[PDB]
Design a protein around this ligand. Structure first.
Ligand SMILES: CC(=O)N[C@@H]1[C@@H](O)[C@H](O[C@@H]2O[C@H](CO[C@]3(C(=O)O)C[C@H](O)[C@@H](NC(C)=O)[C@H]([C@H](O)[C@H](O)CO)O3)[C@H](O)[C@H](O)[C@H]2O)[C@@H](CO)O[C@H]1O
Ligand SMILES: CC(=O)N[C@@H]1[C@@H](O)[C@H](O[C@@H]2O[C@H](CO[C@]3(C(=O)O)C[C@H](O)[C@@H](NC(C)=O)[C@H]([C@H](O)[C@H](O)CO)O3)[C@H](O)[C@H](O)[C@H]2O)[C@@H](CO)O[C@H]1O
Ligand SMILES: CC(=O)N[C@@H]1[C@@H](O)[C@H](O[C@@H]2O[C@H](CO[C@]3(C(=O)O)C[C@H](O)[C@@H](NC(C)=O)[C@H]([C@H](O)[C@H](O)CO)O3)[C@H](O)[C@H](O)[C@H]2O)[C@@H](CO)O[C@H]1O
Ligand code: NAG
Ligand code: NAG
Ligand code: NAG
Ligand code: NAG
Ligand code: NAG
Ligand code: NAG
Lengths: 172, 317, 317, 172, 172, 317
């Protein structure tokens, strides 16, 4: 990846996560839990299907026969025709390989990017009440029961609520 | 306490290529190159003429196998390997140019040219064109001298295209097996066919001589053609060895022509054809046949180009 | 307290396409596909020859409408629909190959070939080529038998190209209305024109016969041509029905030829031309005419491809 | 965007900002004020006009006529010519669409990126004396009169100046 | 760059660094020292040689002669041939220029990105015991002898070790 | 204390182009466009035939300079500027189509066609084809009337291709300097050569007349050719001015033909050739010759396209 996530400082996917591309996995005190993030998941899904709609493209140009597989056309015009068709086959084969390699590079990178965006959104959401452990997890230095984790997930965590408690639990 | 961000994976990813790596594993992928053929001519909704044993140029001249095709009408014209343009042996000059005209013609509509004749016969026949007995090309006339060895009086005939699109005109030259036989058919002397219009200029003499027997015949008929523009006249000055047009052809509209050896199928629809069938596909590329005609994915050399439709698959270790 | 980072927006953004979305709104954009024509031939600074009623091949043979063009000199040659290559009816063999030679010739320069004649006439004329009275092709000679019905003595003439570039050579064959008339012009017998050089080999016989009247004429003149390499000789063995060259042509340099029905304009400059005018543009693409010639944007099928020149427009809600 | 800014955690443009692409908007105690950043603005402007100079490109290849719209060339060579011209039209139409879609994707992304760079520069400039509110604004936990804001803008803010005051105002 | 590093908030290369593309340069108390990072260096090297292996590509299509430089073919077929060859030369010249410009843009950007990734890895590695000076350096607010710097380099620095000392040295 | 991250630089970077900037300096770069020629024909490991003074079409007819080439076998055929297809002056119809057939033929293998003759001579010779004395084309026969001025009895000959690939057949027409000389060689009358098969139809008459002296000759030989399909027969009805085939050619396999003026070199290997040598390269593009043949980098107009292989070079200030 270009953004250092989907094979970077996370470097592990979750085969368990079967209802989204991206998810929160937390463990507090009531045990561990795992959920999807439909927002980011939908952003990557929509960008990629945008690519798909673009390339599954139907040309409207009709081409007709210019030679004949039952009665060979004259040799000189047939060699010009064959040389032309082969030159255009070269062009389109190059175009198709390059198109797919470029597109794949950018697909992987925008998936990576959506991960980095989500992570950064939660980091900014948690303000001074958490630390970056370096593997994709926020060490949260205050009690965060299931409800509090769901407030992180659904984008309603209020850092002011635990700011004093958490800062005190971080420093001394 | 803790909360972790992550992404999904699978035990079963698909390798793809990128600009920097070959064989990166991604969660999901999809094919851009059509490999799958349908071994039929998908003709659903299209006026289709399967020429079978009638060769495409025979629709203009009318050998017996083309009798049910002399005025066909089509959006999709299909040529078959078993087709023949001739009954009495011969061929057309600039035949393939004419095949391409007729493939996109939408069919032909015939019109009497109104040639009338004088001191000659008009009923030349042969056993190579059998309709019951010996016959000829339905659209043409085998003109002779009135009786064995007699003079062919140097005639002229004209036809004016009084229609608003160009007239396909076709005539023939009969190359007898010998100048003896050419004399029995048309009399002696170097015989000369002159043909002119407002943009056309050409001339023809017969070439008697012994040839490979074809259809049991050592003689040959040259066929030639031109396009009369609207309101123009075509003029035939001739003195023998002349296979004259009885009707002219007009083009009906537009169509597409293919060559194939697979069956018509009216249960499927397709715009991309080749000799082995129909490429139904929405993919941008195909690796089935570089000579596919119609509206087609582009032909490419590679059999497969997987397009990533998911993120990089990094499996649970 | 506070300090905020931000970017700009507008109430009026332009939609563009990307790899992932169709119709993303961006702050500013700009067109890559030229739609705008100039309906004139922009010839500012170019030596321009507008052939008008003179057809391009007539500059070599010299029908009256080409009298002011027999030695033209140009960077830009313009052909007009009203042009005609002929006065007495006829046409050239490989005419379009010759048109392409003359379009890029930079013009032609004529040189006497120095054919001198013996027991024949040389002043054949017609009312189809009027210069005051009846005349002919300025660069050619209509050679006859010396008096009605007399023999044409089988002559030979040679011309050596003593110049350092190739010589355009043109001759004609006269197809009389009949072998009676061919006899009155050149005497009886099958008449044969032979033409050879160090790389050329061909032969021609006349084809008398009745044709469509064109310019009030039922006869026709075939015109043929070849390129004499420097220091090579061309040889004409002939016995009648021969329209002989009086002068040969040499090419001046290089040019471009277009076909158009719009007026010359010396107030604008342009390198990209089509029948309807001049594509002045710096854009990489154009959707005006796929047969545009010169130095042009590439022709594309789409009428518009907007290139983003600003950031994504996210409007103030 | 690929960098999560120009339609990401900012997600609003300023129609007011009419003298640059990117700007600072602050409110301290003397009221609110808005200014442009000519450095980033010029970087995006220069990259984009670089694209423009590249594509507004004049080919030097002359092509001549090979057929004839007054006197149709012979049918077989004319069909080969038409089939060739149409194949090249297909190629160039694909090239032009792909070129513009790729370029637009990258233009939007480099604009987005210039935003992210500017934001990060100010974050690093403010050191320990500020917090990330999560919408593009730095909550500055010390007095920052107009002069101090201009020191942020023109890249002369000295974090050591307010470091004690601000840290004390952040913790307790 | 797209990621604001290799000509961004670093904006200086080290001509001294002659054994890797990316490196740590530190000064503690035993003087200053400079080392390479083989991990990032190898990632950029491998991606770029991946590009190279792709483009140093050998086509397997044979083309034959269709005209003749000793005996010119006939003029009309020769003009069609020349017009076709020139059209394909136009196509391939455009393809090659675009391919190289695109690829160069992305090479520079993935180099830039590898820098940003490495920097971020060390930032996350140092946790609360360091600050971002804004020019590529981590001001480390505790003693970090040569061994400690090597623990940063070789990815074994334990932030818990100096966390109390460093935090105390940062606040008051 | 402190620890800093950084990247490398050099005093000597290479400028490249990107989508947004022209002349960005990067640490390292590499060339994508091959400029370097090898001025030899790299033939290591390839069966190579250097035709030298034998012209490629002469391998079928057999002028003296082609005597060591009448049955050549090759993977790489090299044509030379000094080559000539003829000894007695003449040329082939559709010569370049035939050159392209023979370039990829892998060579030719000859077979007696078994024509036997009656009341004619068969040993026509000339001083333009010297093998010691005056001779002719090794694969052909100059057929005459049995003695000066006598009749040529209108003969027919047939050859059946009893092989599983098509037979190259070649014949000639002798154009005498005059109808006097044509009469001394073949008797009087318009002489007619007819040639037919199952897909072929054509005819030929001689064209006596005076031409440019070439090789000390004013006469010319037309050469014509056709491809007999397996199990088909070719038929020659003729009465004079006929240069008859003695042997037919069959194609051996496949090859490539080039034109060059540089020497063969068996020390280097190459698949991309042009008149000036061998393009050995792995680069995707070349700027040496747009008419390069074989397996080649694509020809591009630019002389250089530097591909960045390092990061942006930002030098130590
Ligand atoms: C002009 C003529 O009558 N010539 C005689 C040959 O026809 C004949 O050769 C035999 O021809 C047989 C079939 O020939 C027909 C046919 O059915 O094609 C009879 C047709 O009525 C006749 N048509 C016309 C308009 O004249 C036609 C024609 O003559 C030729 O096709 C023209 O070349 O011939 C069959 O092929 C036999 O196998 C063949 O021997 C010979 C006698 O052998 O005498 C010729 O004078
Ligand atoms: C050879 C000859 O004289 N033939 C007679 C025809 O010319 C003539 O037909 C009439 O021709 C009229 C105009 O013909 C000219 C002309 O102006 O073109 C007179 C020219 O001097 C003559 N030129 C030469 C070199 O011979 C020229 C020429 O004969 C023909 O063009 C060649 O085909 O003809 C006009 O077209 C009349 O409408 C037409 O009737 C007929 C008499 O009807 O007698 C022919 O013997
Ligand atoms: C048919 C004939 O004999 N014609 C006489 C001319 O040959 C002769 O012209 C002279 O020809 C000289 C060389 O001619 C040969 C040759 O070596 O090519 C002699 C060959 O045996 C003969 N071959 C055959 C099969 O007939 C050949 C042939 O006639 C011509 O090439 C056909 O066009 O000619 C040499 O070129 C002299 O320079 C030339 O004058 C003239 C006498 O001048 O008389 C003709 O009757
Ligand atoms: C052109 O290519 C076809 C196959 O694509 C081949 O069968 C045909 O013979 C070729 N024409 C030639 C070699 O003249
Ligand atoms: C993989 O991609 C194709 C095309 O987008 C889609 O039809 C298929 O359902 C996808 N499979 C999964 C598991 O997403
Ligand atoms: C939009 O872009 C075009 C081309 O770059 C430019 O001429 C025009 O002035 C621009 N408009 C604005 C408002 O920037
Ligand atoms: C080639 O295309 C032109 C229009 O581009 C058309 O008018 C012409 O008739 C075509 N030639 C054919 C169909 O032979
Ligand atoms: C085609 O181009 C070659 C050079 O590429 C030139 O020498 C030749 O004369 C051209 N053919 C023409 C102009 O008919
Ligand atoms: C620069 O790149 C080329 C091609 O990758 C390589 O052969 C050469 O050794 C490189 N030079 C350096 C100093 O890396």
């Amino acid at each position: 990846g270009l953004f250092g996530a989907i094979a970077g400082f996370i470097e592990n996917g979750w085969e368990g996560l079967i209802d989204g591309w991206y998810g929160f996995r937390h463990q507090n005190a009531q045990g561990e839990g795992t959920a999807a993030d439909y927002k980011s998941t939908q952003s990557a899904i929509d960008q990629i299907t945008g690519k798909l709609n673009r390339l599954i493209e139907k040309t409207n140009q009709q081409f007709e026969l210019i030679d004949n597989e039952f009665n060979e056309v004259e040799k000189q015009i047939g060699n010009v025709i064959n040389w032309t068709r082969d030159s255009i086959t070269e062009v389109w084969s190059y175009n198709a390989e390059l198109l797919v390699a470029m597109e794949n590079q950018h697909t992987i990178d925008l998936a990576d990017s959506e991960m980095d965006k989500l992570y950064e959104r939660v980091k900014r959401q948690l303000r001074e009440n958490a630390e970056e452990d370096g593997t994709g997890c926020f060490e949260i230095f205050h009690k965060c029961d299931d409800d509090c984790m769901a407030s992180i997930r659904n984008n309603t965590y209020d850092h002011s609520k635990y700011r004093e408690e958490a800062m005190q639990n971080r420093i001394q | 306490d803790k909360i972790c961000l992550g992404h999904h994976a699978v035990s079963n990813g698909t390798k793809v290529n990128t600009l920097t790596e070959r064989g990166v594993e991604v969660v999901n992928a999809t094919e851009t190159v059509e490999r799958t053929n349908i071994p039929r001519i998908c003709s659903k909704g299209k006026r289709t003429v399967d020429l079978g044993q009638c060769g495409l140029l025979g629709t203009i001249t009318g050998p017996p196998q083309c009798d049910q095709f002399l005025e066909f009408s089509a959006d999709l014209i299909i040529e078959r390997r078993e087709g023949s343009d001739v009954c009495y042996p011969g061929k057309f000059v600039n035949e393939e140019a004419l095949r391409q005209i007729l493939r996109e013609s939408g069919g032909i509509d015939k019109e009497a040219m109104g040639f009338t004749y004088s001191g000659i016969r008009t009923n030349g026949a042969t056993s190579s064109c059998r309709r019951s007995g010996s016959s000829f090309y339905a659209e043409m006339k085998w003109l002779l001298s009135n009786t064995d060895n007699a003079a062919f009086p140097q005639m002229t005939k004209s036809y004016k295209n009084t229609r608003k699109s160009p007239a396909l005109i076709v005539w023939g030259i009969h190359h007898s097996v010998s100048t003896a036989e050419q004399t029995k058919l048309y009399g002696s002397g170097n015989k000369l066919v002159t043909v002119g219009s407002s943009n056309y200029q050409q001339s023809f003499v017969p070439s008697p001589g012994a040839r490979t027997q074809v259809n049991g015949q050592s003689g040959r008929i040259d066929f030639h053609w031109l396009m009369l523009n609207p309101n123009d006249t075509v003029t035939f000055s001739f003195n023998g060895a002349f296979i004259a047009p009885d009707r002219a052809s007009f083009l009906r509209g537009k169509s597409m022509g293919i060559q194939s050896g697979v069956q018509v199928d009216a249960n499927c629809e397709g715009d991309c054809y080749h000799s082995g069938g129909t490429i139904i596909s929405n993919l941008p590329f195909q690796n089935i046949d570089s000579r596919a005609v119609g509206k087609c994915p582009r032909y490419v050399k590679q059999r497969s180009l997987l397009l990533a439709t998911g993120m990089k698959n990094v499996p649970e270790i």
